[PDB]
Structures are given as structure tokens and as C-alpha cells.
From a paper:
The tandem-repeat galectins, of which [name] is a member, contain two distinct CRDs at their N- and C-termini, connected by a variable-length linker region that is susceptible to proteolytic degradation. The overall fold of human galectin-4N is the conserved galectin β-sandwich fold comprising two β-sheets, F1–F5 and S1–S6, of which the concave side of the β-sandwich (S1–S6) contains the saccharide-binding site. As with other galectin CRDs, the amino acids forming the binding sub-sites C and D are conserved, while those that construct the A, B and E sub-sites are slightly different, granting galectin-4N its unique binding specificity. To investigate the interaction between human galectin-4N and its natural saccharide ligands, we have determined the crystal structures of human galectin-4N in complex with glycerol (the cryoprotectant), lactose, lactose-3′-sulfate (3′SuL), and 2′-fucosyllactose (2′FL) at 1.70–2.00 Å resolution.
The cryo-protectant glycerol was able to soak into the binding site of the apo-crystal. The binding sites of all 4 of the monomers displayed clear density for the bound glycerol molecule. The binding of the glycerol molecule is not influenced by crystallographic contacts in any of the 4 monomers. The oxygen atoms of the glycerol molecule are found in positions that mimic galactose O4′, O5′ and O6′ and interact with the conserved residues His63, Asn65, Arg67, Asn77 and Glu87. The carbon atoms of the glycerol molecule mimic the cyclic ring of galactose and make a van der Waals interaction with Trp84. In addition to the glycerol molecule, a water molecule is found in interaction distance of Arg67 and Glu87 residues and mimics the conserved interaction observed between lactose C3 hydroxyl and these two protein residues. In our human galectin-4N-glycerol complex structure, the binding site of galectin-4N is pre-organised to interact with saccharides. Due to the weak electron density and the lack of proper coordination, we have assigned water molecules at these positions for the galectin-4N-glycerol, galectin-4N-3′SuL and galectin-4N-2′FL complex structures, despite the high concentration of Na+ ions in the crystallisation condition.
Author numbering: 15 to 152
């Protein structure tokens, strides 16, 4: 797949589903993001925004965009990615939260703010190369 990636999730998002992303973080990475998006119209809500950042104290930001407004940011001050390194990024969709697993290590649990069944698309962009995106357990 090529970037930017913005594709429908087959059968929409459901509990039990996993999203498995294999990529390589850019040698020159500042940020990238993975968005679980409600539709493909301009100004679509983002149920879940997953945003690793190397600017400043290395961290990952988690948020929701609803009605044009970013919510209260959640943050984990730990960077499971590495500039120039291949990664395995898994989102396990559970009833209570998205469980994020990076290179086999449980990383974060992001509680649902928008109903997960409203999600139609996965969007991925930023400072990385994409090797594959797979939807499992749909």
C-alpha cells in the first residue's frame, strides 16, 4: 500500500476485530498517525487518533475528533517506535477500548468516545513506509 492510505474497513469496525499494520518508521520521522475515521467526507469525525511524536519528549498522543473539535488528549510518554526501524502495530478492538500492541508489547488501552460501529475507514499517513495493512477477525 501507498501513502497516504485512506481505505474502507471491510464490513466496518466490529468488536473482536484486529487491525495489523506492518511498516517502517522513517529515518527522519517526526510524526505519523493512524485514524479510525467516521466516513470519507471532508471534516469527518475521527473516533480514534493514534499519533506517535518525536518532537520534544518522545511520546504517543491519543485523541478523538468530534464535530470539528479535538477532545482531551491522552498521552503516553514512551516511544515504542524507532527511526528507521520496522514495526508491527496492532489494534485489538474490544468492547471497552482499543487495545494497542506494538512489536508484541501491550502499549495502551484507549476507551471508546465515539461508538466503534460508526467507524468506516482507516487512515494512515506521515513519516513512515507501509508494508502491509490487514484486517483480522471481522
Amino acid at each position: 500500500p501507498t501513502l497516504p492510505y485512506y481505505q474502507p474497513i471491510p464490513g466496518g469496525l466490529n468488536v473482536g476485530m484486529s487491525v495489523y499494520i506492518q511498516g517502517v518508521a522513517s529515518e527522519h520521522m517526526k510524526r505519523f498517525f493512524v485514524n479510525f475515521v467516521v466516513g470519507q467526507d471532508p471534516g469527518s469525525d475521527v473516533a480514534f487518533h493514534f499519533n506517535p511524536r518525536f518532537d520534544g519528549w518522545d511520546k504517543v498522543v491519543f485523541n478523538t475528533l468530534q464535530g470539528g473539535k479535538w477532545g482531551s488528549e491522552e498521552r503516553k510518554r514512551s516511544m515504542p517506535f524507532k527511526k528507521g526501524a520496522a514495526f508491527e502495530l496492532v489494534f485489538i478492538v474490544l468492547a471497552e477500548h482499543y487495545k494497542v500492541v506494538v512489536n508484541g508489547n501491550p502499549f495502551y488501552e484507549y476507551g471508546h468516545r465515539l461508538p466503534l460501529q460508526m467507524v468506516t475507514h482507516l487512515q494512515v499517513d506521515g513519516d513512515l513506509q507501509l508494508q502491509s495493512i490487514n484486517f483480522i477477525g471481522g
